[PDB]
Ligand binder design. Structure first.
Ligand SMILES: [Mg+2]
Ligand SMILES: [Mg+2]
Ligand SMILES: [Mg+2]
Ligand SMILES: [Mg+2]
Ligand SMILES: [Mg+2]
Ligand SMILES: [Mg+2]
Ligand SMILES: [Mg+2]
Ligand SMILES: [Mg+2]
Ligand SMILES: [Mg+2]
Ligand SMILES: [Mg+2]
Ligand SMILES: [Mg+2]
Ligand SMILES: [Mg+2]
Ligand SMILES: [Mg+2]
Ligand SMILES: [Mg+2]
Ligand SMILES: [Mg+2]
Ligand SMILES: [Mg+2]
Ligand SMILES: [Mg+2]
Ligand SMILES: [Mg+2]
Ligand SMILES: [Mg+2]
Ligand SMILES: [Mg+2]
Ligand SMILES: [Mg+2]
Ligand SMILES: [Mg+2]
Ligand SMILES: [Mg+2]
Ligand SMILES: [Mg+2]
Ligand SMILES: [Mg+2]
Ligand SMILES: [Mg+2]
Ligand SMILES: [Mg+2]
Ligand SMILES: [Mg+2]
Ligand SMILES: [Mg+2]
Ligand SMILES: [Mg+2]
Ligand SMILES: [Mg+2]
Ligand SMILES: [Mg+2]
Ligand SMILES: [Mg+2]
Ligand SMILES: [Mg+2]
Lengths: 201, 150, 261
RNA sequence: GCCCGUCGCUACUACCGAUUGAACGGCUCAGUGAGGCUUUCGGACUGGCCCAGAGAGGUCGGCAACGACCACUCAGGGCCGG
RNA sequence: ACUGGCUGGGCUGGGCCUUUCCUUCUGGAGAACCGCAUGCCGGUGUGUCGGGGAACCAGGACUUUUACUCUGAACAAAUUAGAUCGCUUAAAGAAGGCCUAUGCUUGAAUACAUUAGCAUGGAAUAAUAGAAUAGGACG
RNA sequence: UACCUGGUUGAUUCUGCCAGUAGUCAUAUGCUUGUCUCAAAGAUUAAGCCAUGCAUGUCUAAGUAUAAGCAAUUAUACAGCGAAACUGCGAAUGGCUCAUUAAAUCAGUUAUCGUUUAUUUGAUAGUUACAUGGAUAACCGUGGUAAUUCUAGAGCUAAUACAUGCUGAAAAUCCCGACUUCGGAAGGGAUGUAUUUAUUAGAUUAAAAACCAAUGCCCUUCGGGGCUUUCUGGUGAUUCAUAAUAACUUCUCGAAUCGCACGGCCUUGCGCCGGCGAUGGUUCAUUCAAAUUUCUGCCCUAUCAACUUUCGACGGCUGGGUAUUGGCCAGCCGUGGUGACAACGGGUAACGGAGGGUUAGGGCUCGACCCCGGAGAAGGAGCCUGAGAAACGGCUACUACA
RNA sequence: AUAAGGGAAGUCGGCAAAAUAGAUCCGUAACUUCGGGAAAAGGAUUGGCUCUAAGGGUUGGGCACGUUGCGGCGUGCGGUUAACAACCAACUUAGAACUGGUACGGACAGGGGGAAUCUGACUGUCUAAUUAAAACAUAGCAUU
């Protein structure tokens, strides 16, 4: 089958090597698996030494971590928007490592509301559609939460605009074809500005 | 080396596992701990160049600010080609002994090595290289020091 | 070659086994175990070729099936068990204990030892570090792993093992002035005192020793085995590994012959 | 005395030569293309449940108040697997 | 076997003064030369004395660079040269030997390979670098 | 044992070859042949073709026994030996040959901080239970085909085959908080390991102060004088060994197995506790290794002087794939790499080496063949099982024989 | 204009007809006056639809004062935006996915080729109304 040896190549002087031996059990290769967004589907494969690997054919969710605070919540991925290697990967919407995606921001907004007693990215005040208040059952909570707000600080203006729409950009940092998991982190700061600057022009 | 800009590529270049966007600012002496540039020392009495510590270039093959370890032989030579990108060719000369005729003849070999942006290498120079893991089809050495010109 | 080997050809066996080139085509092919394959002492060769207790293979393998012979206090039942440096072999029915140690000519020799001293060993340490859960441990040259050691103990040292409880009673530092015996290289059987050590950055250092007779020699660190500072703890065999040259070797041979008769 | 070349007869060796001469072998453009790994639908055949409940029957204790369980036939639906 | 020698003659080597002699700091233990009082037959333990570190060890920095040669390390069994033992001698073999033993004892050595790679001493021979627009050395 | 003789001329001295001479662990052949110690042998031409027979199986006190098996008579669950069969392991080692192969194999010397590893050896893992569920072999009995180690449907029963499954501890850490006097607190959840991602610690190795912000405290004459301070391994070198936090997973492991011994307690219940072995099991270490990898070294030929990049040729970047690195592969961007110090190509009656033959020294020639390494099983490709195979006394397909 | 199977067996003779044909990318011999032979010979692709990438133009750049009613000026004096911002404009080339009764230069337009001999060097010209050729002319050469 597919071979990954260097025998069939050409020497650095340009000379052509001659036949040495037939293909070996090692040095083999395998058919690439193109991950796509859809209902979960994973196959098991028996690799060298009796171990196993996990081929992911269709995935829809994975862990993504928010950097500064350090909390990670499981949510779903909407779609891929950029890929440094090939554009056709983007158009076919297939996801691999170093793929820029868009993720749901709901679990992170909820956790932020629980940790800090203030709302983040709410420009729906024009509509006043979902205004609701629940009585908060304590008074030590305001001093602890306001202590957190006065100590840690406030979010940069760029991230609330993302939170109002409810979509966040992320980068896959796992290898879906190898480990069968799509994992990443929410990207922000100057590296974020790099991607918005490149994304629309 | 001479590089106009650091980020001039399709993807974003950054050192792995170096966290760069932290809300709280803490000043520490450690190179990689605080969130600033990371670097190490190869050893064998080789001193880290000054340009590396404050430079902004990103390279994953430099022995400094990179993910490559140096182990094996250490060799020296004369550069013969440095006109491609981030790689040079050195020329090594030696003497082979023919037993029957009781005298020598000259022979030579060609070697390929990876050059870091920290150094500036011109033609006809002495360099010292060290063995490393396979970095390409025919590149297995890295430059460590450039000897002064005559 | 499509897997691991399981046959060993005669004329390729280690020289210090002293196997005749005739009378067969194969050799015992020692099984895998605690000691290196190149320098080991198979139990079948030791019992049959040196002690001459068993005439041939058939009853040689019967002996271990009766569980008569044990090493390090634990009975072994496989004929090709790799024995090695400093290990203690005990035969209770006849009532004696043996220790495997090189002679001055680089081969294993029979060496009677007393019962009270035949119940402990000592070995050089190979690596020390902390394992899973933060528990420190070390491993010696005979695949002995011991947890919670003395924190001052470092690599290349030697440690005394009880062999019944596996506790670290005592140790010897690796420094100048110690008494050492060589275990690898062409300098087989020598015993000397560390004079001074010179190091080379990048690996493969050399150490210089000095014998009792003012002889001088050098060897790699991987071949030095310190056995004491002064008055070595173990009992050395006859000759003490001094490596007399052939001129006096023949002189003493004739002197001893005429002295006896 | 020695001795050189053409021409004629016999014997042998190699060379040029119309015949788009002939046979065998290696590497290759193009066309056709067995088999198999991976992959997408497919579901021969099989297993497990849960409800409602037809129809009948039995069980062990309860005066009773009431509980529980086990065999037959037609099943109704499902609604999940390999 | 063998002792002093001989003011013996050679030869190898190691210390100083000749304008040259031999890098440097930290730490280790500690000698030689000194006196203190305590004790014997003009020397010594003496110590819980310090003035004092010959040599040695461990660690750091500095030192033109190659070829060459000396000595080490590492490197296969067989083979080649080669030591020992009367397989009745020998080509072979690694055996055997000792009074009488219900026992004791030994050998199964050693040198070479030779190209490349790793350390150490020597510094002749044969190449290379350095202060001239001083861009030089020192405090 | 560092050696020569005959031959051009009427006779002489030379260059020069022809012939003679000796060895061969070097083959064939002719004549002849009594004994002792040792014993090579279808390599050369055809890696051409094969009738026949053999060359790989395996059981202990200790996985599974209702043999209409034998043998005894302590075992009414069995208890000895034990056909058949399931299950476990091996069959990838050995043995043969030299077709291909000219920096390829190979040799000496390095590296793996760039990987996999059955087995052996040593350590090591506290979140219905007095015992869970369906099949199947052997077996009884009935068939098909000229033909094979081909098999159908019907009726039974086992597991160390297959599939499920039980916080017995405390302490500590992190979050939510019912409830106040605002200065801490009722009680609620999580917390082994494997897998995947992000973040934190993993210290230095000379010393003397003075200010701002504001809080553990001792003593005390209430004016206060003040404040010594606890750990941190290793390499020449790392993001190392290891620890902690927020989460994740068609997802692991943490024992429903077997044999010998017949013991000890009192609340005397068919109660509780207790020894030595076998077979398994997560991680680390070790052993046998395996795959890649650094430097230098191979015969003749110029009537072979320029070669390599169509469709990777040299390098950079992002990924895929592999046990892992790598132009091994997919995209984007540069235009490189080798050569008269002999590249590239053509020949080889070429497997390489340790080594054999022949000797003053220097050399010439041979090496299929008992030792080490590589490759192949008529010629090509593809693959299952398994730790390990691109295996051929394993399978699939084509060509040629049969 | 079309024809099953055969494919020049018809005939003085392949006369007539058929076959090839555009564009893009590979590949290309003997011979030679080194200019050619060459479109040698001989192969592959070609529609529709939805996308991606490349090839341009114009206008803007610091202070310090003085006229003229925030501006045109007059000046003096610095920096080269690690090249940014807005607007405007036609076509030509390359690449990817899906799709169809495998069809796509869909009509028109549009070279058959190869191995040899005789003869004139070539382009050119003539018997208007039966002969276009090997005939004539030609540059070159030689003579009077
Ligand atoms: Mg084999
Ligand atoms: Mg090392
Ligand atoms: Mg083809
Ligand atoms: Mg097919
Ligand atoms: Mg002999
Ligand atoms: Mg004559
Ligand atoms: Mg043959
Ligand atoms: Mg054959
Ligand atoms: Mg039994
Ligand atoms: Mg051959
Ligand atoms: Mg184990
Ligand atoms: Mg099982
Ligand atoms: Mg890569
Ligand atoms: Mg060049
Ligand atoms: Mg051959
Ligand atoms: Mg050979
Ligand atoms: Mg094979
Ligand atoms: Mg095969
Ligand atoms: Mg066969
Ligand atoms: Mg076989
Ligand atoms: Mg027709
Ligand atoms: Mg027709
Ligand atoms: Mg035809
Ligand atoms: Mg006719
Ligand atoms: Mg005709
Ligand atoms: Mg016509
Ligand atoms: Mg054509
Ligand atoms: Mg033509
Ligand atoms: Mg198309
Ligand atoms: Mg066409
Ligand atoms: Mg004409
Ligand atoms: Mg006319
Ligand atoms: Mg006409
Ligand atoms: Mg004319």
């Amino acid at each position: 089958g597919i071979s990954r040896d260097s025998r069939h190549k050409r020497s650095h002087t340009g000379a052509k090597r001659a036949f040495y031996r037939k293909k070996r059990a090692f040095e083999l290769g395998r058919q690439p698996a193109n991950t796509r967004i859809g209902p979960k589907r994973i196959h098991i494969v028996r690799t060298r030494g009796g171990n196993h690997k996990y081929r992911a054919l269709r995935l829809d969710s994975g862990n993504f971590a928010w950097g500064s605070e350090g909390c990670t919540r499981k949510t779903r991925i909407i779609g891929v928007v950029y890929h440094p290697s090939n554009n056709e990967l983007v158009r076919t919407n297939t996801l691999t490592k170093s793929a820029v995606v868009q993720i749901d921001a709901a679990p992170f907004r909820q956790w932020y509301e629980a940790h800090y007693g203030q709302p983040l990215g709410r420009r729906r005040q024009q509509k006043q559609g979902q205004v609701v208040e629940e009585v908060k059952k304590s008074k030590s909570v305001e001093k602890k939460q306001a202590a957190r707000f006065a100590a840690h600080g406030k979010v940069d203006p760029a991230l609330e605009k993302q939170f109002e729409a409810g979509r966040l950009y992320a980068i896959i940092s796992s290898r879906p074809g190898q480990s069968g998991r799509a994992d990443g982190y929410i990207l922000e700061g100057e590296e974020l500005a790099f991607y918005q600057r490149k994304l629309h022009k | 080396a001479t590089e106009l800009t650091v980020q001039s590529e399709r993807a974003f270049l950054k050192q792995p596992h170096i966290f760069l966007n932290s809300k709280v600012k803490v000043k520490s002496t450690r190179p990689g701990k605080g969130g600033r540039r990371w670097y190490k020392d190869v050893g064998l009495g080789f001193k880290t160049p000054k340009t590396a510590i404050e430079g902004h270039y990103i390279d994953k093959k430099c022995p400094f600010t990179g993910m490559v370890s140096i182990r094996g032989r250490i060799l020296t030579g004369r550069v013969v080609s440095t006109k491609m990108h981030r790689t040079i060719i050195i020329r090594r000369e030696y003497l082979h002994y023919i037993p029957k005729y009781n005298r020598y003849e000259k022979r030579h070999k060609n070697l390929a090595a990876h050059v870091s942006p920290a150094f500036r290498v011109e033609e006809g120079d002495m360099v010292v290289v060290g063995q490393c893991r396979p970095l390409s089809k025919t590149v297995r050495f890295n430059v460590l020091r450039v000897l002064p010109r005559t | 070659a499509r897997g691991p080997k399981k046959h060993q050809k005669r004329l390729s066996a280690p020289s210090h086994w002293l196997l005749d080139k005739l009378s067969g085509a194969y050799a015992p092919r020692p099984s895998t175990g605690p000691h290196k394959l190149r320098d080991c002492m198979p139990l079948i060769v030791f019992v049959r070729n040196r002690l001459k207790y068993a005439l041939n293979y058939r009853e040689t393998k019967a002996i271990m099936m009766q569980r008569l012979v044990k090493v390090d206090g634990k009975v072994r039942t496989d004929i090709t068990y790799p024995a090695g440096f400093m290990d203690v072999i005990t035969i209770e029915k006849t009532g004696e204990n043996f220790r495997l140690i090189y002679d001055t000519k680089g081969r294993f020799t029979v060496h009677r030892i007393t019962d009270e001293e035949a119940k402990y060993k000592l070995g050089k340490v190979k690596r020390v570090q902390l394992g899973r859960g933060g528990v420190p441990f070390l491993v010696t040259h005979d695949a002995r792993t011991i947890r919670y050691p003395d924190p001052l103990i470092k690599v290349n040292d030697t440690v005394k093992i009880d062999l019944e409880t596996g506790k670290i009673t005592d140790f010897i530092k690796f420094d100048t002035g110690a008494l050492a015996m060589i275990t690898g290289g062409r300098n087989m059987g020598r015993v000397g005192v560390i004079t001074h050590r010179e190091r080379h950055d990048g690996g493969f250092g050399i150490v210089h020793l000095k014998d009792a007779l003012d002889n001088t020699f050098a060897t790699r660190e991987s071949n030095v085995f310190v056995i004491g500072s002064e008055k070595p703890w173990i009992s050395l065999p006859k000759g003490k590994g001094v490596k007399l040259t052939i001129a006096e070797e023949r002189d003493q041979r004739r002197a001893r012959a005429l002295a006896a008769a």
